[PDB]
Amino acid sequence: QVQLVQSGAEVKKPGSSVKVSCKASGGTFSSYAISWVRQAPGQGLEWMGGIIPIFGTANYAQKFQGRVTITADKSTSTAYMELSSLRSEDTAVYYCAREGEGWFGKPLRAFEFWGQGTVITVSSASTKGPSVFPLAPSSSGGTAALGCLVKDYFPEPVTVSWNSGALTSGVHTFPAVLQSSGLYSLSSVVTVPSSSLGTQTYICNVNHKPSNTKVDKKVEPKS
Amino acid sequence: IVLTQSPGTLSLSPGERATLSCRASQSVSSSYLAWYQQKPGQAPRLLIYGASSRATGIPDRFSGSGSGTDFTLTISRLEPEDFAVYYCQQYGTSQSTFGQGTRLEIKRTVAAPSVFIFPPSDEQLKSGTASVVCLLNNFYPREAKVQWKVDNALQSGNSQESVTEQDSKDSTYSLSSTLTLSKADYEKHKVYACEVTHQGLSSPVTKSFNRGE
Amino acid sequence: VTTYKLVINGKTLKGETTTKAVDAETAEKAFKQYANDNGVDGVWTYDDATKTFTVTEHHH
Known part of the structure; x- marks a missing residue:
């Protein structure tokens, strides 16, 4: 069955170039268009271009003519996209999509199959593990809120759990925010009964794979 | 081509009927109009191709209509898994544009x-x-x-x-x-x-x- | 160029993180800043066989 597997996330310096790969398995790789569609954080779908491998002819959105190159390698059923002189506005998820087939007569004229996406971050920042600060419950009717502030890391993503995954009810982990420093920042909060602050331990488990940070912060009530 | 979707946000209750609109600045051939569903953190998913045809595996409460410059996606009874962002698309070999998306949100x-x-x-x-x-x-x-x-x-x-x-x-x-x-x-x-x-x-x-x- | 590791043994912050440096002295300077950024103050030890720093706060 048709499957598109894309290469992994990349951080790139501004002005450089990146090559993203999309390997297709389980279908003919020849007469069906492979396109590239990008999505900047919080924004819509934007078609970049596409190629019919058997003909080799690539088309591009006007916006990207001159710094994108889409190629296809029939020897490995892989499609490639090269984007050069990267700018910050090129931070996005890049999807590869393949046209579907008709029943007997053909082109679907729609993207039936999508890759899982490739996160491209364009930044001059260096890899940095997070700082984890407590958001301490104070002394909201019988309910207390606490959490962790996961600050000044790069790149995305970080994962947060509470008490090694045993605490899930009331948990809110917010989408990260990009600071003027170039570093990301996010908060995870949990709502708990005020009565439990004296008897339960609340530990936020922070994982940042790019820096191999695995770190556990005990959040205790301030007196 | 400019594809314009309306409304930008649609707040409805499960069980209600959703009507999503895609309007084009110029005429679009019906077999080139496609609809996609996207949920947070996931790739887009094809719902409708050719303005009115359901892709494989899409429940029959999704339907599409329209021609020329006016196209519509209808969801006749909203199931909770239907609340998402929806994109129309004008498919093309040399040029392809997407609508800006409609967010279908639960009303409470x-x-x-x-x-x-x-x-x-x-x-x-x-x-x-x-x-x-x-x-x-x-x-x-x-x-x-x-x-x-x-x-x-x-x-x-x-x-x-x-x-x-x-x-x-x-x-x-x-x-x-x-x-x-x-x-x-x-x-x-x-x-x-x-x-x-x-x-x-x-x-x-x-x-x-x-x-x- | 060579990966160094930091194990954190604090009262409220426990775990590990890494960094890439040429020197053990360049990694030490990166780790000591990180530990201060997280408000950790403790005793420092180093094992060159494993390229691992350890900071341990008094009690836990």
Whole structure:
């Protein structure tokens, strides 16, 4: 069955170039268009271009003519996209999509199959593990809120759990925010009964794979 | 071509009928109009191709219609898994454009937020920066306003915020806002307050603390 | 160029993180800043066989 597997996330310096790969398995790789569609954080779908491998002819959105190159390698059923002189506005998820087939007569004229996406971050920042600060419950009717502030890391993503995954009810982990420093920042909060602050331990488990940070912060009530 | 979707947000209850609109600046052939569904963190999913044909595996409560410049996606009875972002697309070999997306959100009763404020921790103040966090928990609708005040002076340009997706259990939203100052600026003031405006509050709510106490 | 590791043994912060440096002295300077940024103050030890720093706060 048709499957598109894309290469992994990349951080790139501004002005450089990146090559993203999309390997297709389980279908003919020849007469069906492979396109590239990008999505900047919080924004819509934007078609970049596409190629019919058997003909080799690539088309591009006007916006990207001159710094994108889409190629296809029939020897490995892989499609490639090269984007050069990267700018910050090129931070996005890049999807590869393949046209579907008709029943007997053909082109679907729609993207039936999508890759899982490739996160491209364009930044001059260096890899940095997070700082984890407590958001301490104070002394909201019988309910207390606490959490962790996961600050000044790069790149995305970080994962947060509470008490090694045993605490899930009331948990809110917010989408990260990009600071003027170039570093990301996010908060995870949990709502708990005020009565439990004296008897339960609340530990936020922070994982940042790019820096191999695995770190556990005990959040205790301030007196 | 410019594809314009309406409305931008559609708030409906499960069981209701959703009608999504895609209008084109110029005529689009019916076999080139496709609809996609996208959920947070996932790739888009093909729903309708050729304006009216359901892709393999799409339940028959999804239907598409239209020709020329007016196209429509109808969902006859909203199941909870149908709340998502929807994109129309004009498929093309040499040029292809997407609509800007419609967000289909669950409508529920108004719920005022619970507001908490957290001072910067002692361990952060060791490092020369101070972060103040205001939490707005489980409110609906999504629109909320947060004003920071330092010694009753309105702040500006020194905060960032973000909002959760809509909760699957109770359909509410939560919001976190962080006000950032140097440690030196934080030591020069005493009252840190966060004032929340929202539809479920008959008047702005203020949560605050005095530095030190 | 060579990966160094930091194990954190604090009262409230426990775990590990890494960094890439040429020197053990360049890694030490990166780790000591990180530990201060997280408000950790403790006793420092180093094992060159494993390229691992350890910071341990008094009690836990």
